[PDB]
Design a protein around this ligand. Structure first.
Ligand code: ZN
Ligand code: ZN
Length: 87
């Protein structure tokens, strides 16, 4: 259907994808608040808990940067779409 930039898992639709992203990638490890982006998560952890997060949780090592803004399928670089749908 669609796939997650961070982990390459497939989902039947974007709504399900967004919930998975919030749960597995944008969740604060200390309090479990679900933020809306990986950047948002890292800023939360820092500001609330004073901890530095530089890797997205549960992500492939090449996808682990907090700096790219991914919302469901929105923001995925065209190269990564390519690599996923063949390779
Ligand atoms: Zn994922
Ligand atoms: Zn928290």
């Amino acid at each position: 259907k669609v796939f997650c930039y961070y982990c390459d898992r497939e989902f039947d639709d974007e709504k399900i994808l967004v919930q998975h992203q919030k749960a597995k990638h944008f969740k604060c490890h200390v309090c479990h608040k679900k933020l809306s982006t990986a950047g948002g998560m890292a800023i939360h952890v820092l500001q609330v808990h004073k901890e530095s997060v530089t890797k997205v949780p549960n992500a492939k090592p090449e996808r682990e940067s907090t700096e790219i803004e991914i919302f469901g399928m929105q923001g995925i670089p065209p190269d990564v779409l390519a690599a996923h749908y063949g390779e």
